[PDB]
Design a binder for this molecule. Structure first.
Ligand SMILES: [Cu+2]
Ligand SMILES: [Zn+2]
Ligand SMILES: [Zn+2]
Ligand SMILES: [Zn+2]
Ligand SMILES: [Zn+2]
Ligand SMILES: [Zn+2]
Length: 180
């Protein structure tokens, strides 16, 4: 159980995170998130993205029954956090720091459609950042240095935390904007 955060040196909070916590240095929150608003740490679903895992249109919710609202997708629905190409630090906070296999970070394809439900066809399915977990328990907060590819405008980053001693992963999409 854990979520992408911006408490110390994280660049951008998860979509779900902003359902509960206000955005570092702007105050914005996401609204109408459903029951997951009480427990952003709980966006867990089946392993194996992208070959299996959460189906198209259910990637943002991970197929969670509490987080169905996260699968809504228009150009205006979600709070967008600024990012740039090049080095960036992503941050997870864990409420339960399970044994970890790895973390992987997907980015959307440049000319993805921001008004259709997220699918595999929306994402570059080669991750842009893979961090080894070494099948041990992380600390309660971690920072991951990643090189973010160049993009224009609104983009989504999927962060996947793959738990070493189950067949489940935690999926946090992040809404980012590469232009003001
Ligand atoms: Cu957990
Ligand atoms: Zn719960
Ligand atoms: Zn797994
Ligand atoms: Zn679990
Ligand atoms: Zn531009
Ligand atoms: Zn521009």
């Amino acid at each position: 159980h854990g979520y992408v955060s911006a408490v110390e040196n994280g660049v951008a909070e998860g979509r779900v995170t902003l359902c509960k916590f206000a955005a570092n240095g702007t105050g914005e929150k996401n609204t109408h998130c459903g029951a997951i608003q009480y427990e952003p740490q709980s966006v867990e679903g089946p392993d194996g993205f992208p070959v299996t895992g959460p189906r198209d249109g259910k990637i943002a919710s991970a197929e969670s029954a509490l987080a169905a609202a996260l699968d809504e997708q228009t150009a205006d629905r979600w709070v967008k956090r600024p990012i740039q190409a090049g080095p960036q630090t992503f941050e997870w906070t864990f409420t339960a720091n399970h044994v970890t296999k790895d973390w992987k970070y997907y980015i959307t394809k440049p000319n993805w459609n921001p008004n259709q439900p997220l699918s595999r066809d929306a994402f570059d399915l080669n991750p842009f950042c893979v961090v080894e977990g070494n099948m041990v328990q992380p600390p309660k907060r971690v920072s991951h240095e990643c090189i973010v590819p160049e993009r224009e405008g609104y983009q989504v980053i999927l962060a996947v935390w793959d738990v070493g001693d189950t067949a489940a992963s935690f999926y946090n999409v992040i809404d980012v904007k590469f232009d003001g």
